[PDB]
Write a protein that binds this ligand. Structure first.
Ligand SMILES: CN[C@@H]1[C@@H](O[C@H]2O[C@H](CO)[C@@H](N)[C@H](O)[C@H]2O)O[C@H]2C[C@@H](N)[C@@H](O[C@H]3[C@H](O)[C@@H](O)[C@H](N)C[C@@H]3N)O[C@@H]2[C@@H]1O
Ligand SMILES: CN[C@@H]1[C@@H](O[C@H]2O[C@H](CO)[C@@H](N)[C@H](O)[C@H]2O)O[C@H]2C[C@@H](N)[C@@H](O[C@H]3[C@H](O)[C@@H](O)[C@H](N)C[C@@H]3N)O[C@@H]2[C@@H]1O
Ligand SMILES: CN[C@@H]1[C@@H](O[C@H]2O[C@H](CO)[C@@H](N)[C@H](O)[C@H]2O)O[C@H]2C[C@@H](N)[C@@H](O[C@H]3[C@H](O)[C@@H](O)[C@H](N)C[C@@H]3N)O[C@@H]2[C@@H]1O
Lengths: 272, 272, 273
């Protein structure tokens, strides 16, 4: 598919040459082949778009006096940062991701696995959070890679049972999960992709939480298994929030309405 | 002793040359010295065995149309994948590992530490699972690296007390862990190498579980600390399973009795 | 700002050349600018100090027969190991770290974020442990990166409310946390940098524990969220330990009192007063 980098370069490269900051990998070279590129030496934002290969390389680049006139995404990006936030809506494999939303390699993998339908705007997911499905639980075995030994006939009856399974092994037979906007997920959290179809808008998933069922909008869930500890707002305000959907506002609307975003009391007065 | 790649090349290289896909590392070049190798350009499975250096390199390889004649393990492997599954029983730091069994870097480390006696067949361990022992808890200090300041005399006094400690700090004076066959371990799980000697065949360890005691065969454990939630099968069927040991079956046997593998009621009718 | 490597070379390089064991990186070559360095081939501790670039590189070096003449820290180090243990007290992003103390990249990042005041001596932190703060919980939004869209007037109003927030979003307006000496933190543990200011001396944080408030000295905490399960020692010996502070002892004193360190009963007979 189109990587994050490719989506950014299609939007912001603007005919410049890519200055690679770090050791180029084969995956990077494949992504840059539609573009002119070279190993960064002296860089000028009028002439160059800087791609740091790793986050390590970005730290070095941003520590260098040459980076001062380079703006995030517009002039530079990290290649190995497929979950990194962007100022525009993007695709992660074939999952739409909203603005200013970030996540780590586990969620990137879940996006590739087809476990995720969409990730909302202004959503914050700690890099250590994980999303995996259940194996089959209604067979004699729980192994998945046993199937590498299955011939065509055995694999057919095995696959056929996997669909009829109402418990959705490997996320079969279910809708991929929606992760809403203005969502927060802390370190080492886990969401089960066989048994969860929605993390509601505004949900907060605490560190260490193991989420086995849907999280309602603006619920705060903690623990193993994860349980609703409280809601962020009253029922009336949650009702208003889901109607107004400030997370779809334009940048101008976000700034014009900043007092209502900073103050829930002013939000309710204006919209509720 | 031998890395995973070396065990695979010993079995499958078949007089071909190794085509390296990705930037090589010091440890890869050490593993490749007995074999002729070169940087991959054009590759053909009749002539070449493709070694992807990193998991990212493999992703790039399998996206290239040159790869679709290449079979997993038989014609290509990832070097940085010591926990990766294989169609034959292998060694991981002198720990026997069964067919189609995979685990991540934490479990690889525990094998190197001598914490694990063996890992069974068709066993599936999430890459973020961890296995560590306890430090000593019957001394004034809990630190391990204070011993870096111990002269000869102090080290001898410290080691003699560790060796008679019935709680097996650093897994001293206990049997290394057996992990059974048809076992599942989910994300962020932990197993204490000081207090656990067996994960029974068929055991399922839920994501986030913190396992401090042996897990009986076919038990499902969850939580912090881990406690049994349920058993996969009746006591009679568990007895039957531990007798038949389908996980030692030939590939022919697996396909012939695939009906019994997918239907536990057929399994008990045929073998119970 | 000085890397761990530079701090070690400043003390131990002793006029030698750095032999780089592994593929060098941008960050390594910048840290090696003040030094003589070359790609390692044949290495001799008389002439060379070996820097493994990655931990995997270090595994390869230590499997090589040339490495048996090299002592840890004195003659070799890993570049990608900013939280690695050392025989001297060091800085990690302006955070003092005691001797023989180790931690992983999660704690290193917490150091860089300003969340940690100091980390004590002989403290063992699993590499998978994580320390981060809460976002603001008193606004309409919980996102942080929404602020990339704030103009200067919006950002000012946002930052003003964060600074007056008594629950310390992003660790605002609180003391960075102290992590004591002789501390142990297990795999996948988490400490909340918004609501924790002290992990007491001698505390044990079990694997998977989610620590949301201060851990008293020598308490053992487990669970999500973490709860005190037991103390390592009696009240009297905890008082004695906090006074003797053997973790500040010199190498000479540590070996002279090895018996008191190994047997708590002997520790109290000598120090319990
Ligand atoms: C550079 N500082 C940032 C900090 O900013 C906060 O403290 C700053 C200094 O006091 C303030 N100037 C700022 O207003 C305030 O918001 O907010 C945290 C929030 C946390 N979820 C995470 O998200 C990042 C992810 O970790 C990362 O992976 C992703 N790429 C980007 C995310 N923002 O890391 C950032 C980062 O540590
Ligand atoms: C590539 N797809 C796989 C999926 O297969 C399932 O969904 C497919 C598409 O719907 C089906 N065709 C297939 O029959 C079914 O089993 O099962 C999961 C099971 C999970 N424990 C893990 O194990 C992998 C580890 O994560 C990895 O590290 C290790 N190398 C190999 C393991 N299989 O990742 C795989 C992987 O996401
Ligand atoms: C190389 N072996 C070491 C082992 O030594 C123990 O078993 C040995 C016998 O097999 C004994 N000779 C030794 O006396 C005893 O203490 O103690 C553990 C303690 C654990 N917190 C971790 O800490 C390490 C961190 O994982 C690492 O990241 C950090 N750099 C250094 C830490 N010690 O990994 C080490 C490592 O596995």
């Amino acid at each position: 598919m189109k990587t994050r980098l490719e989506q950014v370069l299609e939007r912001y490269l603007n005919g410049r040459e890519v200055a690679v900051w770090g050791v180029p990998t084969r995956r990077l070279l494949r992504a840059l082949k539609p573009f002119k590129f070279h190993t960064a030496d002296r860089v000028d934002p009028q002439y160059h778009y800087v791609v740091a290969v790793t986050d390590d390389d970005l730290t070095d680049f941003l520590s260098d006096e040459q980076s001062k006139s380079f703006q995030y995404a517009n002039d530079y990006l990290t290649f190995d940062d497929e979950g990194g936030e962007l100022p525009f809506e993007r695709m992660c494999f074939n999952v739409p991701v909203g603005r200013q939303t970030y996540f780590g390699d586990g969620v990137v993998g879940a996006c590739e696995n087809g476990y995720i339908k969409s990730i909302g705007q202004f959503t914050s997911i700690n890099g250590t959070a994980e999303i995996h499905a259940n194996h089959q639980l209604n067979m004699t075995f729980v192994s998945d890679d046993i199937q590498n030994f299955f011939n065509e006939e055995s694999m057919a009856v095995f696959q056929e049972k996997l669909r009829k399974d109402p418990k959705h092994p490997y996320a079969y037979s279910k809708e991929p999960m929606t992760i809403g906007s203005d969502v927060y997920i802390g370190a080492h959290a886990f969401i089960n992709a066989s048994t969860v179809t929605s993390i509601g808008d505004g949900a907060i998933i605490g560190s260490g939480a193991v989420v086995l069922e849907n999280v309602p909008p603006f619920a705060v869930v903690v623990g193993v298994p994860a349980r609703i500890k409280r809601y962020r707002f009253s029922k009336e305000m949650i009702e208003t929030l889901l109607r107004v959907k400030w997370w779809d506002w334009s940048i101008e609307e976000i700034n014009e309405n900043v007092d209502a975003l900073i103050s829930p009391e002013l939000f309710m007065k204006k919209y509720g």
